[PDB]
Amino acid sequence: TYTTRQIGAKNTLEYKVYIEKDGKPVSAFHDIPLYADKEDNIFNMVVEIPRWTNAKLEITKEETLNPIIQNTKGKLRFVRNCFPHHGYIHNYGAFPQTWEDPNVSHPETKAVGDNNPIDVLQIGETIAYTGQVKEVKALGIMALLDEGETDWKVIAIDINDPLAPKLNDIEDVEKYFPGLLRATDEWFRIYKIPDGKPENQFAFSGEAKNKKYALDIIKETHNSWKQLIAGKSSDSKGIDLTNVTLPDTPTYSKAASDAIPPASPKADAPIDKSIDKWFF
Amino acid sequence: TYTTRQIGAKNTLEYKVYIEKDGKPVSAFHDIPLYADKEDNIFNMVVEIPRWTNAKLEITKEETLNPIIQNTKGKLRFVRNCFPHHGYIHNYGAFPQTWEDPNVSHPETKAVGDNNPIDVLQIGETIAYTGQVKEVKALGIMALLDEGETDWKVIAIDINDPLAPKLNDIEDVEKYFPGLLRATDEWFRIYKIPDGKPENQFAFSGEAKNKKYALDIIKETHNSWKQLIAGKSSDSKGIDLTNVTLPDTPTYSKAASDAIPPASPKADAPIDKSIDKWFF
């Protein structure tokens, strides 16, 4: 996408993240393709959860979509610091341009699909870029069945980062990052534990596929989101489609950019000392 | 001790940390007792390595002692981010007022003793205070024999922090923080690995004692440092003893406080992206 605007905050509850594309705002999940960068190579992705971070920000329902500190009980959602590890490790992306239809769950995914786009986790040597739009190639794919919701795990890396031609499938890692697998598997369950959510239960007995399953899963991810733009296609379009990158959608308001107020970066808001808590 | 002055930096190489006691500077390892706070309870300690931190700062040879980013090869010493875990986890203290005499190693400590004071690691819910002088009670004690050097591990916690009357011995943790033990054991070895230092090899086959061994080990720690102040006592006094808290030492220059230039906190200096590296 390019650069983004920092809406001063980081927790408070006003920190509005807005990524900008070239010369003007943008829109993740919409104004963010994917199969870009050597169609026969990989694609770009967005970030909204740097490693070692108890914070969790998303992007949906706002206009152009943007990460945030999800709420629910009037307050920022801080992910527990599970004993093993720290806060949030893996980074997190969200191959924007896709949508996990709640219904349609393909074979081997009863929990059908969900709302939020797709979850992507890249093990890039460098930290995250809370909205940092960097490239990366898909490796393996992980699936997690939680609260009747078809969840999947994508493996992407900074194609530009070292270990490029080194990682091109699941097998690898084990040799390079032999401990990133099972390390991710659980960490997810307990992720809900200290919060009111016991375990989850990974799909496929608990095994993940390779890029083959990723590319496909990632492919049928955009299409499901593409065949949606159409207009009414989806019988349930609860979100902002508006896209100035598709003059073929009754939502091409290329004027929804200037409207976006200029960035207002303030300062990282202090986080309750409750976080940094190793929940065993 | 009280408050301290931040010598702007955090890495650059000018970040000079200087803790202040009440109304005036101080001196760790010297102007920092220990058996203070219910002689029949615990004692205070200093910090210089917050959890999840690849940075390593000490305090010795400067005047009043102060943490730093040890060098050796013209450059800040950044601890690897070993795969398992992150950067630096445990915090780290240094029951100032003691000294591990290079010679004299008691029975069960061939590698005799070393220089640096004593290493202390407290699992306080709250983060560290790079120099934060907080209380805490001693629990267990760990020893590590590396490069012919009698190293020990102290277990202290924010007596004020939760899990107080809960933790009072090694056994515990296992139930409270069942995973903090072995978690510390190694993490140390590989600590040198990605740097040029293979493994280490914990002492006592690799087992640690309880508070009993800690209190004693911690006790004979100060004495060894006390019987030193005397003056020449130690045949090798390579450091600054100057102490304005002991008008009984040819180094009681209570005037070494005003001299200390006022704090000059600047801003956290950017750290090479080389750090945040999970070395498997």
Side-chain angles (χ1 to χ4, degrees), chain A residues 151-194:
Chain A
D151 237 354
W152 294 91
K153 275 16 231 195
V154 175
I155 257 178
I157 280 209
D158 236 37
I159 306 178
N160 31 225
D161 133 269
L163 266 109
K166 304 184 189 179
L167 285 79
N168 112 138
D169 236 282
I170 296 268
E171 29 283 25
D172 305 276
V173 173
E174 294 283 25
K175 304 184 189 179
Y176 277 59
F177 326 56
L180 218 170
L181 274 170
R182 227 1 175 162
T184 313
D185 296 354
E186 310 283 25
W187 125 245
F188 266 124
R189 341 202 267 259
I190 82 190
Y191 124 99
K192 304 184 189 179
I193 338 264

mmCIF file of all heavy atoms in Angstrom, chain A residues 151-194:
data_model
loop_
_atom_site.group_PDB
_atom_site.id
_atom_site.type_symbol
_atom_site.label_atom_id
_atom_site.label_comp_id
_atom_site.label_asym_id
_atom_site.label_seq_id
_atom_site.Cartn_x
_atom_site.Cartn_y
_atom_site.Cartn_z
ATOM 1 N N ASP A 151 -11.068 -21.278 10.958
ATOM 2 C CA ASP A 151 -9.868 -20.434 11.031
ATOM 3 C C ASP A 151 -8.695 -21.145 10.353
ATOM 4 O O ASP A 151 -8.573 -22.376 10.419
ATOM 5 C CB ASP A 151 -9.544 -20.116 12.507
ATOM 6 C CG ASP A 151 -9.486 -18.630 12.750
ATOM 7 O OD1 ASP A 151 -9.569 -17.779 11.883
ATOM 8 O OD2 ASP A 151 -9.407 -18.297 13.902
ATOM 9 N N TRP A 152 -7.852 -20.358 9.710
ATOM 10 C CA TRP A 152 -6.685 -20.914 9.011
ATOM 11 C C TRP A 152 -5.435 -20.113 9.379
ATOM 12 O O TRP A 152 -5.526 -18.969 9.849
ATOM 13 C CB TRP A 152 -6.956 -20.895 7.506
ATOM 14 C CG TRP A 152 -8.109 -21.832 6.987
ATOM 15 C CD1 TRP A 152 -9.412 -21.563 6.824
ATOM 16 C CD2 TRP A 152 -7.948 -23.147 6.536
ATOM 17 N NE1 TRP A 152 -10.097 -22.745 6.335
ATOM 18 C CE2 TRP A 152 -9.219 -23.648 6.131
ATOM 19 C CE3 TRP A 152 -6.842 -23.960 6.436
ATOM 20 C CZ2 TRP A 152 -9.456 -24.926 5.618
ATOM 21 C CZ3 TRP A 152 -7.095 -25.253 5.933
ATOM 22 C CH2 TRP A 152 -8.338 -25.697 5.504
ATOM 23 N N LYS A 153 -4.286 -20.725 9.160
ATOM 24 C CA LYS A 153 -3.009 -20.070 9.476
ATOM 25 C C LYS A 153 -2.132 -20.022 8.222
ATOM 26 O O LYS A 153 -1.867 -21.055 7.591
ATOM 27 C CB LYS A 153 -2.267 -20.803 10.587
ATOM 28 C CG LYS A 153 -2.680 -20.410 11.992
ATOM 29 C CD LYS A 153 -4.004 -19.653 11.981
ATOM 30 C CE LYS A 153 -3.911 -18.348 12.758
ATOM 31 N NZ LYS A 153 -5.257 -17.808 13.046
ATOM 32 N N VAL A 154 -1.697 -18.824 7.882
ATOM 33 C CA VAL A 154 -0.850 -18.637 6.695
ATOM 34 C C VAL A 154 0.598 -18.400 7.128
ATOM 35 O O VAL A 154 0.858 -17.811 8.187
ATOM 36 C CB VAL A 154 -1.370 -17.466 5.871
ATOM 37 C CG1 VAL A 154 -0.491 -17.088 4.652
ATOM 38 C CG2 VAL A 154 -2.822 -17.633 5.503
ATOM 39 N N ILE A 155 1.519 -18.863 6.304
ATOM 40 C CA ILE A 155 2.950 -18.708 6.604
ATOM 41 C C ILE A 155 3.611 -17.853 5.523
ATOM 42 O O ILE A 155 3.824 -18.310 4.390
ATOM 43 C CB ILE A 155 3.676 -20.076 6.654
ATOM 44 C CG1 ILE A 155 3.967 -20.551 8.104
ATOM 45 C CG2 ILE A 155 4.897 -19.813 5.769
ATOM 46 C CD1 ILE A 155 4.653 -21.935 8.180
ATOM 47 N N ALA A 156 3.928 -16.624 5.888
ATOM 48 C CA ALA A 156 4.565 -15.696 4.944
ATOM 49 C C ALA A 156 5.831 -15.109 5.572
ATOM 50 O O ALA A 156 5.945 -15.012 6.803
ATOM 51 C CB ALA A 156 3.628 -14.506 4.678
ATOM 52 N N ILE A 157 6.763 -14.730 4.719
ATOM 53 C CA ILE A 157 8.031 -14.155 5.190
ATOM 54 C C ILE A 157 8.449 -13.006 4.272
ATOM 55 O O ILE A 157 7.972 -12.896 3.132
ATOM 56 C CB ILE A 157 9.168 -15.207 5.199
ATOM 57 C CG1 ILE A 157 9.117 -16.141 6.439
ATOM 58 C CG2 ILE A 157 10.412 -14.324 5.067
ATOM 59 C CD1 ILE A 157 10.501 -16.671 6.880
ATOM 60 N N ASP A 158 9.332 -12.166 4.781
ATOM 61 C CA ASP A 158 9.814 -11.014 4.006
ATOM 62 C C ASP A 158 10.699 -11.500 2.857
ATOM 63 O O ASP A 158 11.934 -11.427 2.929
ATOM 64 C CB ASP A 158 10.588 -10.051 4.931
ATOM 65 C CG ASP A 158 10.011 -8.660 4.883
ATOM 66 O OD1 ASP A 158 8.822 -8.400 4.796
ATOM 67 O OD2 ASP A 158 10.805 -7.765 4.999
ATOM 68 N N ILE A 159 10.053 -11.992 1.815
ATOM 69 C CA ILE A 159 10.784 -12.499 0.644
ATOM 70 C C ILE A 159 12.121 -11.767 0.515
ATOM 71 O O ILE A 159 13.078 -12.289 -0.075
ATOM 72 C CB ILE A 159 9.986 -12.285 -0.666
ATOM 73 C CG1 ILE A 159 8.551 -12.878 -0.600
ATOM 74 C CG2 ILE A 159 10.926 -12.898 -1.708
ATOM 75 C CD1 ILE A 159 7.719 -12.638 -1.882
ATOM 76 N N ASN A 160 12.166 -10.568 1.068
ATOM 77 C CA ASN A 160 13.389 -9.757 1.012
ATOM 78 C C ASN A 160 14.301 -10.116 2.186
ATOM 79 O O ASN A 160 15.522 -9.898 2.137
ATOM 80 C CB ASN A 160 13.022 -8.258 1.035
ATOM 81 C CG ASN A 160 11.753 -8.016 1.810
ATOM 82 O OD1 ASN A 160 10.840 -7.293 1.446
ATOM 83 N ND2 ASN A 160 11.624 -8.739 2.990
ATOM 84 N N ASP A 161 13.697 -10.658 3.226
ATOM 85 C CA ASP A 161 14.455 -11.045 4.425
ATOM 86 C C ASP A 161 15.246 -12.325 4.142
ATOM 87 O O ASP A 161 14.882 -13.117 3.260
ATOM 88 C CB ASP A 161 13.489 -11.242 5.612
ATOM 89 C CG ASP A 161 13.783 -12.522 6.354
ATOM 90 O OD1 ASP A 161 13.178 -13.489 5.976
ATOM 91 O OD2 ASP A 161 14.525 -12.614 7.316
ATOM 92 N N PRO A 162 16.316 -12.505 4.894
ATOM 93 C CA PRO A 162 17.167 -13.691 4.722
ATOM 94 C C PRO A 162 16.328 -14.958 4.904
ATOM 95 O O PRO A 162 15.217 -14.913 5.453
ATOM 96 C CB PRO A 162 18.238 -13.526 5.755
ATOM 97 C CG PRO A 162 17.631 -12.657 6.842
ATOM 98 C CD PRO A 162 16.654 -11.753 6.095
ATOM 99 N N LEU A 163 16.872 -16.068 4.441
ATOM 100 C CA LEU A 163 16.170 -17.354 4.547
ATOM 101 C C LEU A 163 15.062 -17.424 3.494
ATOM 102 O O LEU A 163 14.065 -18.143 3.665
ATOM 103 C CB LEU A 163 15.576 -17.521 5.960
ATOM 104 C CG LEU A 163 16.398 -18.263 6.993
ATOM 105 C CD1 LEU A 163 16.904 -17.290 8.030
ATOM 106 C CD2 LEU A 163 15.572 -19.338 7.656
ATOM 107 N N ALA A 164 15.251 -16.678 2.421
ATOM 108 C CA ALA A 164 14.261 -16.648 1.337
ATOM 109 C C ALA A 164 14.234 -18.005 0.627
ATOM 110 O O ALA A 164 13.406 -18.872 0.943
ATOM 111 C CB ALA A 164 14.686 -15.619 0.278
ATOM 112 N N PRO A 165 15.140 -18.166 -0.320
ATOM 113 C CA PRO A 165 15.219 -19.419 -1.083
ATOM 114 C C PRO A 165 15.427 -20.593 -0.123
ATOM 115 O O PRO A 165 15.516 -21.755 -0.549
ATOM 116 C CB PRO A 165 16.363 -19.202 -2.023
ATOM 117 C CG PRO A 165 17.253 -18.168 -1.360
ATOM 118 C CD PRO A 165 16.285 -17.297 -0.564
ATOM 119 N N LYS A 166 15.501 -20.275 1.155
ATOM 120 C CA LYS A 166 15.705 -21.306 2.182
ATOM 121 C C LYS A 166 14.352 -21.882 2.608
ATOM 122 O O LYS A 166 14.225 -23.089 2.860
ATOM 123 C CB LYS A 166 16.424 -20.743 3.402
ATOM 124 C CG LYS A 166 17.757 -20.083 3.102
ATOM 125 C CD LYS A 166 18.451 -19.643 4.387
ATOM 126 C CE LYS A 166 19.679 -18.794 4.098
ATOM 127 N NZ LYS A 166 20.326 -18.355 5.354
ATOM 128 N N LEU A 167 13.363 -21.010 2.684
ATOM 129 C CA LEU A 167 12.015 -21.431 3.087
ATOM 130 C C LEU A 167 11.075 -21.371 1.882
ATOM 131 O O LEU A 167 10.933 -20.322 1.236
ATOM 132 C CB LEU A 167 11.492 -20.526 4.219
ATOM 133 C CG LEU A 167 12.049 -20.735 5.612
ATOM 134 C CD1 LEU A 167 13.407 -20.083 5.715
ATOM 135 C CD2 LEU A 167 11.119 -20.154 6.649
ATOM 136 N N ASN A 168 10.448 -22.497 1.596
ATOM 137 C CA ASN A 168 9.519 -22.578 0.460
ATOM 138 C C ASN A 168 8.492 -23.683 0.711
ATOM 139 O O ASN A 168 7.752 -24.083 -0.199
ATOM 140 C CB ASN A 168 10.310 -22.841 -0.840
ATOM 141 C CG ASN A 168 10.015 -24.211 -1.395
ATOM 142 O OD1 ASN A 168 9.842 -24.463 -2.574
ATOM 143 N ND2 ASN A 168 10.013 -25.245 -0.466
ATOM 144 N N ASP A 169 8.465 -24.161 1.941
ATOM 145 C CA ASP A 169 7.527 -25.231 2.315
ATOM 146 C C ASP A 169 7.540 -25.418 3.834
ATOM 147 O O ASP A 169 8.394 -24.859 4.538
ATOM 148 C CB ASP A 169 7.916 -26.539 1.593
ATOM 149 C CG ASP A 169 6.764 -27.083 0.786
ATOM 150 O OD1 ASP A 169 5.917 -27.657 1.416
ATOM 151 O OD2 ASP A 169 6.676 -27.029 -0.428
ATOM 152 N N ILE A 170 6.593 -26.202 4.314
ATOM 153 C CA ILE A 170 6.488 -26.462 5.758
ATOM 154 C C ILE A 170 7.760 -27.155 6.249
ATOM 155 O O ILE A 170 8.531 -26.589 7.038
ATOM 156 C CB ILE A 170 5.279 -27.371 6.089
ATOM 157 C CG1 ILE A 170 3.916 -26.716 5.737
ATOM 158 C CG2 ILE A 170 5.520 -27.685 7.567
ATOM 159 C CD1 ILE A 170 3.275 -25.944 6.914
ATOM 160 N N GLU A 171 7.959 -28.372 5.777
ATOM 161 C CA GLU A 171 9.141 -29.152 6.173
ATOM 162 C C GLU A 171 10.222 -28.212 6.706
ATOM 163 O O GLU A 171 10.582 -28.259 7.892
ATOM 164 C CB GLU A 171 9.726 -29.960 4.981
ATOM 165 C CG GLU A 171 9.527 -29.361 3.572
ATOM 166 C CD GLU A 171 8.083 -29.547 2.972
ATOM 167 O OE1 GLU A 171 7.123 -29.692 3.670
ATOM 168 O OE2 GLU A 171 8.173 -29.502 1.744
ATOM 169 N N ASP A 172 10.729 -27.372 5.821
ATOM 170 C CA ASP A 172 11.781 -26.419 6.200
ATOM 171 C C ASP A 172 11.607 -26.016 7.666
ATOM 172 O O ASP A 172 11.655 -26.864 8.571
ATOM 173 C CB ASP A 172 11.721 -25.183 5.276
ATOM 174 C CG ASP A 172 11.808 -25.578 3.825
ATOM 175 O OD1 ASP A 172 12.920 -25.745 3.399
ATOM 176 O OD2 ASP A 172 10.855 -25.677 3.070
ATOM 177 N N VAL A 173 11.409 -24.729 7.880
ATOM 178 C CA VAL A 173 11.233 -24.209 9.243
ATOM 179 C C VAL A 173 11.812 -25.200 10.252
ATOM 180 O O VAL A 173 12.839 -24.931 10.894
ATOM 181 C CB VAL A 173 9.755 -23.959 9.512
ATOM 182 C CG1 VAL A 173 9.414 -23.574 10.972
ATOM 183 C CG2 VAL A 173 9.148 -23.010 8.510
ATOM 184 N N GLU A 174 11.146 -26.333 10.379
ATOM 185 C CA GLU A 174 11.592 -27.371 11.320
ATOM 186 C C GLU A 174 13.118 -27.352 11.419
ATOM 187 O O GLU A 174 13.687 -27.446 12.518
ATOM 188 C CB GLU A 174 11.140 -28.790 10.870
ATOM 189 C CG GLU A 174 9.621 -29.065 10.863
ATOM 190 C CD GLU A 174 8.987 -29.326 12.280
ATOM 191 O OE1 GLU A 174 9.483 -28.900 13.280
ATOM 192 O OE2 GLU A 174 7.965 -29.994 12.122
ATOM 193 N N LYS A 175 13.759 -27.235 10.272
ATOM 194 C CA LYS A 175 15.229 -27.210 10.226
ATOM 195 C C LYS A 175 15.731 -25.798 10.535
ATOM 196 O O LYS A 175 16.705 -25.615 11.280
ATOM 197 C CB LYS A 175 15.749 -27.645 8.861
ATOM 198 C CG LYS A 175 15.272 -29.013 8.408
ATOM 199 C CD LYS A 175 15.923 -29.409 7.086
ATOM 200 C CE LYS A 175 15.296 -30.671 6.511
ATOM 201 N NZ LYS A 175 15.921 -31.028 5.219
ATOM 202 N N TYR A 176 15.057 -24.819 9.958
ATOM 203 C CA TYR A 176 15.437 -23.415 10.167
ATOM 204 C C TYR A 176 14.862 -22.918 11.494
ATOM 205 O O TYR A 176 15.600 -22.435 12.367
ATOM 206 C CB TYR A 176 14.932 -22.579 8.977
ATOM 207 C CG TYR A 176 15.887 -22.615 7.774
ATOM 208 C CD1 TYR A 176 16.181 -23.866 7.202
ATOM 209 C CD2 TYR A 176 16.502 -21.482 7.311
ATOM 210 C CE1 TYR A 176 17.095 -23.913 6.068
ATOM 211 C CE2 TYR A 176 17.399 -21.518 6.201
ATOM 212 C CZ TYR A 176 17.684 -22.773 5.648
ATOM 213 O OH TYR A 176 18.568 -22.820 4.590
ATOM 214 N N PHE A 177 13.555 -23.042 11.627
ATOM 215 C CA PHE A 177 12.875 -22.598 12.852
ATOM 216 C C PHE A 177 12.171 -23.786 13.510
ATOM 217 O O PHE A 177 10.994 -23.698 13.890
ATOM 218 C CB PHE A 177 11.891 -21.495 12.506
ATOM 219 C CG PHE A 177 12.319 -20.599 11.381
ATOM 220 C CD1 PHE A 177 12.623 -21.147 10.181
ATOM 221 C CD2 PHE A 177 12.335 -19.233 11.507
ATOM 222 C CE1 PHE A 177 13.021 -20.350 9.069
ATOM 223 C CE2 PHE A 177 12.695 -18.434 10.367
ATOM 224 C CZ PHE A 177 13.057 -19.000 9.201
ATOM 225 N N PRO A 178 12.901 -24.878 13.634
ATOM 226 C CA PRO A 178 12.344 -26.094 14.245
ATOM 227 C C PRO A 178 11.847 -25.781 15.656
ATOM 228 O O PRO A 178 12.587 -25.933 16.641
ATOM 229 C CB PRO A 178 13.476 -27.072 14.209
ATOM 230 C CG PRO A 178 14.743 -26.237 14.190
ATOM 231 C CD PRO A 178 14.345 -24.968 13.442
ATOM 232 N N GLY A 179 10.604 -25.345 15.735
ATOM 233 C CA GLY A 179 10.005 -25.002 17.033
ATOM 234 C C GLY A 179 8.948 -23.912 16.840
ATOM 235 O O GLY A 179 8.317 -23.459 17.807
ATOM 236 N N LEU A 180 8.770 -23.510 15.596
ATOM 237 C CA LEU A 180 7.788 -22.465 15.273
ATOM 238 C C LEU A 180 6.410 -23.097 15.076
ATOM 239 O O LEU A 180 5.376 -22.429 15.221
ATOM 240 C CB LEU A 180 8.217 -21.708 14.001
ATOM 241 C CG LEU A 180 7.967 -20.215 13.945
ATOM 242 C CD1 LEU A 180 8.665 -19.632 12.738
ATOM 243 C CD2 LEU A 180 6.487 -19.927 13.872
ATOM 244 N N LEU A 181 6.414 -24.376 14.749
ATOM 245 C CA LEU A 181 5.157 -25.103 14.526
ATOM 246 C C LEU A 181 4.403 -25.246 15.848
ATOM 247 O O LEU A 181 3.711 -24.315 16.291
ATOM 248 C CB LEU A 181 5.445 -26.491 13.923
ATOM 249 C CG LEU A 181 5.591 -26.596 12.419
ATOM 250 C CD1 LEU A 181 6.103 -27.970 12.056
ATOM 251 C CD2 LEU A 181 4.268 -26.343 11.738
ATOM 252 N N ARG A 182 4.543 -26.408 16.459
ATOM 253 C CA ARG A 182 3.867 -26.676 17.736
ATOM 254 C C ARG A 182 3.855 -25.408 18.590
ATOM 255 O O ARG A 182 2.951 -25.200 19.414
ATOM 256 C CB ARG A 182 4.566 -27.808 18.516
ATOM 257 C CG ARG A 182 3.611 -28.885 19.068
ATOM 258 C CD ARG A 182 2.184 -28.572 18.666
ATOM 259 N NE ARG A 182 1.268 -29.646 19.084
ATOM 260 C CZ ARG A 182 -0.071 -29.484 19.176
ATOM 261 N NH1 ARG A 182 -0.630 -28.272 19.040
ATOM 262 N NH2 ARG A 182 -0.829 -30.544 19.393
ATOM 263 N N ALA A 183 4.861 -24.577 18.383
ATOM 264 C CA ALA A 183 4.971 -23.323 19.144
ATOM 265 C C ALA A 183 3.751 -22.444 18.867
ATOM 266 O O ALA A 183 3.294 -21.694 19.744
ATOM 267 C CB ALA A 183 6.192 -22.529 18.650
ATOM 268 N N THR A 184 3.240 -22.548 17.655
ATOM 269 C CA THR A 184 2.068 -21.754 17.257
ATOM 270 C C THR A 184 0.788 -22.521 17.596
ATOM 271 O O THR A 184 -0.160 -21.959 18.165
ATOM 272 C CB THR A 184 2.205 -21.459 15.751
ATOM 273 O OG1 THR A 184 3.549 -21.012 15.606
ATOM 274 C CG2 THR A 184 1.244 -20.398 15.282
ATOM 275 N N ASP A 185 0.779 -23.792 17.241
ATOM 276 C CA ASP A 185 -0.391 -24.641 17.501
ATOM 277 C C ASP A 185 -1.113 -24.152 18.758
ATOM 278 O O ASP A 185 -2.078 -23.379 18.680
ATOM 279 C CB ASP A 185 0.055 -26.111 17.656
ATOM 280 C CG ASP A 185 0.641 -26.646 16.375
ATOM 281 O OD1 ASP A 185 0.663 -26.044 15.315
ATOM 282 O OD2 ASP A 185 1.166 -27.722 16.456
ATOM 283 N N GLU A 186 -0.632 -24.609 19.901
ATOM 284 C CA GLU A 186 -1.236 -24.222 21.184
ATOM 285 C C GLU A 186 -1.237 -22.698 21.313
ATOM 286 O O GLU A 186 -2.121 -22.013 20.777
ATOM 287 C CB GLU A 186 -0.462 -24.822 22.391
ATOM 288 C CG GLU A 186 -0.163 -26.336 22.341
ATOM 289 C CD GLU A 186 -1.388 -27.266 22.682
ATOM 290 O OE1 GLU A 186 -2.515 -26.902 22.528
ATOM 291 O OE2 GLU A 186 -0.948 -28.340 23.091
ATOM 292 N N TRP A 187 -0.246 -22.189 22.021
ATOM 293 C CA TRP A 187 -0.133 -20.738 22.228
ATOM 294 C C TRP A 187 -1.450 -20.059 21.849
ATOM 295 O O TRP A 187 -1.792 -18.991 22.379
ATOM 296 C CB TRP A 187 1.041 -20.212 21.401
ATOM 297 C CG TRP A 187 0.728 -19.034 20.405
ATOM 298 C CD1 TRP A 187 0.777 -19.019 19.066
ATOM 299 C CD2 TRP A 187 0.274 -17.761 20.768
ATOM 300 N NE1 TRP A 187 0.422 -17.698 18.578
ATOM 301 C CE2 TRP A 187 0.090 -16.989 19.585
ATOM 302 C CE3 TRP A 187 0.005 -17.191 21.992
ATOM 303 C CZ2 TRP A 187 -0.361 -15.667 19.546
ATOM 304 C CZ3 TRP A 187 -0.434 -15.851 21.943
ATOM 305 C CH2 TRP A 187 -0.646 -15.140 20.771
ATOM 306 N N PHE A 188 -2.169 -20.688 20.939
ATOM 307 C CA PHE A 188 -3.455 -20.140 20.482
ATOM 308 C C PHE A 188 -4.542 -20.448 21.513
ATOM 309 O O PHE A 188 -5.289 -19.554 21.938
ATOM 310 C CB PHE A 188 -3.798 -20.731 19.126
ATOM 311 C CG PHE A 188 -3.364 -19.903 17.952
ATOM 312 C CD1 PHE A 188 -2.562 -20.411 16.961
ATOM 313 C CD2 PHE A 188 -3.708 -18.594 17.906
ATOM 314 C CE1 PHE A 188 -2.134 -19.542 15.899
ATOM 315 C CE2 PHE A 188 -3.314 -17.751 16.826
ATOM 316 C CZ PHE A 188 -2.539 -18.260 15.836
ATOM 317 N N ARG A 189 -4.614 -21.708 21.900
ATOM 318 C CA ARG A 189 -5.619 -22.139 22.883
ATOM 319 C C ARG A 189 -5.522 -21.265 24.135
ATOM 320 O O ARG A 189 -6.408 -20.441 24.407
ATOM 321 C CB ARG A 189 -5.422 -23.617 23.277
ATOM 322 C CG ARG A 189 -4.583 -24.436 22.277
ATOM 323 C CD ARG A 189 -4.879 -25.915 22.439
ATOM 324 N NE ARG A 189 -3.926 -26.550 23.363
ATOM 325 C CZ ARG A 189 -2.876 -27.296 22.950
ATOM 326 N NH1 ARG A 189 -2.737 -27.634 21.659
ATOM 327 N NH2 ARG A 189 -1.980 -27.684 23.839
ATOM 328 N N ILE A 190 -4.450 -21.459 24.878
ATOM 329 C CA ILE A 190 -4.236 -20.688 26.112
ATOM 330 C C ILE A 190 -4.447 -19.199 25.832
ATOM 331 O O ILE A 190 -4.709 -18.408 26.750
ATOM 332 C CB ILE A 190 -2.801 -20.880 26.666
ATOM 333 C CG1 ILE A 190 -1.757 -19.974 25.958
ATOM 334 C CG2 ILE A 190 -2.606 -22.391 26.510
ATOM 335 C CD1 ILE A 190 -0.292 -20.316 26.317
ATOM 336 N N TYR A 191 -4.327 -18.838 24.566
ATOM 337 C CA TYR A 191 -4.500 -17.436 24.163
ATOM 338 C C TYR A 191 -5.843 -16.913 24.676
ATOM 339 O O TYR A 191 -5.970 -15.737 25.045
ATOM 340 C CB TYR A 191 -4.402 -17.343 22.628
ATOM 341 C CG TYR A 191 -5.636 -16.687 21.989
ATOM 342 C CD1 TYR A 191 -5.551 -15.327 21.636
ATOM 343 C CD2 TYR A 191 -6.813 -17.369 21.838
ATOM 344 C CE1 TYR A 191 -6.720 -14.692 21.039
ATOM 345 C CE2 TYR A 191 -7.964 -16.755 21.256
ATOM 346 C CZ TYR A 191 -7.862 -15.399 20.912
ATOM 347 O OH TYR A 191 -8.976 -14.793 20.371
ATOM 348 N N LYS A 192 -6.825 -17.796 24.693
ATOM 349 C CA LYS A 192 -8.168 -17.422 25.158
ATOM 350 C C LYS A 192 -8.308 -17.751 26.647
ATOM 351 O O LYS A 192 -8.993 -17.039 27.395
ATOM 352 C CB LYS A 192 -9.252 -18.155 24.375
ATOM 353 C CG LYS A 192 -9.186 -17.960 22.871
ATOM 354 C CD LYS A 192 -10.364 -18.639 22.178
ATOM 355 C CE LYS A 192 -10.199 -18.640 20.667
ATOM 356 N NZ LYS A 192 -11.336 -19.323 20.011
ATOM 357 N N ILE A 193 -7.658 -18.826 27.052
ATOM 358 C CA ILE A 193 -7.711 -19.257 28.456
ATOM 359 C C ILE A 193 -7.829 -18.032 29.366
ATOM 360 O O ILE A 193 -8.938 -17.603 29.717
ATOM 361 C CB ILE A 193 -6.439 -20.044 28.862
ATOM 362 C CG1 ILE A 193 -5.697 -20.658 27.645
ATOM 363 C CG2 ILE A 193 -7.001 -21.034 29.887
ATOM 364 C CD1 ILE A 193 -6.060 -22.137 27.375
ATOM 365 N N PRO A 194 -6.684 -17.490 29.735
ATOM 366 C CA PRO A 194 -6.655 -16.311 30.614
ATOM 367 C C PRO A 194 -7.452 -15.173 29.974
ATOM 368 O O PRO A 194 -6.877 -14.189 29.483
ATOM 369 C CB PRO A 194 -5.198 -16.009 30.771
ATOM 370 C CG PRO A 194 -4.521 -16.575 29.535
ATOM 371 C CD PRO A 194 -5.374 -17.785 29.165
#
